[PDB]
Design a binder for this molecule. Structure first.
Ligand SMILES: Cc1nc(CC(=O)N2CCOCC2)cs1
Length: 171
């Protein structure tokens, strides 16, 4: 059985208990913490691409009111985010299972951009998601996995100083 696990859930959980925030910029900003995933039960000889996208966790815009995050009243449909391809892709099952798969180079932006960067809607809450795509075989297959622990609100600057402090403490 193909097993997907979050590396450093310990640390992600400290961020989640405060409501995590991730900065988005015109040119794109790298994530901290970085999403790192442990995968077992791949065919070491089969070929795979690792894909990352972000699900809008609810249909609302969020605002930091009186030191607390609160959702707007006016939900809108949240279109699916674009997918980021892990730059090691495509690669053998053995490659992926030999060390945690680290999405260290994805950049989150608030603007439609050339390439690479993933555009998110500021003040929307997101749940990171990966897709493991078996490629090069005749039989294409996709396994998807969500990481609730890694939820965050996309922000142009930090609202909760407790997040600012944690970001610096563990970087
Ligand atoms: C808005 C959406 N677009 C997609 C596809 C996508 O972004 N890809 C870029 C990198 O891999 C190839 C396809 C899924 S939802």
């Amino acid at each position: 059985e193909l097993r997907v696990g979050l590396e450093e859930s310990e640390l992600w959980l400290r961020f989640k208990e405060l409501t995590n925030e991730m900065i988005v910029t015109k040119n794109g900003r790298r994530m901290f913490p970085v999403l790192k995933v442990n995968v077992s039960g791949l065919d070491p000889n089969a070929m795979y691409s690792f894909l990352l996208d972000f699900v809008a966790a609810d249909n609302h815009r969020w605002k930091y009111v009186n030191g607390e995050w609160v959702p707007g009243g006016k939900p809108e449909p949240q279109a699916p985010s674009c997918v980021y391809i892990h730059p090691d892709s495509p690669n053998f099952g053995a490659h992926w299972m030999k060390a945690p798969v680290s999405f260290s180079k994805v950049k989150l932006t608030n603007k439609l951009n050339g390439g690479g960067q993933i555009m998110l809607n500021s003040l929307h809450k997101y749940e990171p998601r990966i897709h493991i795509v078996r490629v090069g075989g005749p039989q294409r297959m996709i396994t998807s996995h969500c990481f609730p622990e890694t939820q965050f609100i996309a922000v142009t600057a930090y609202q909760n100083e407790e997040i600012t402090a944690l970001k610096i403490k563990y970087n």
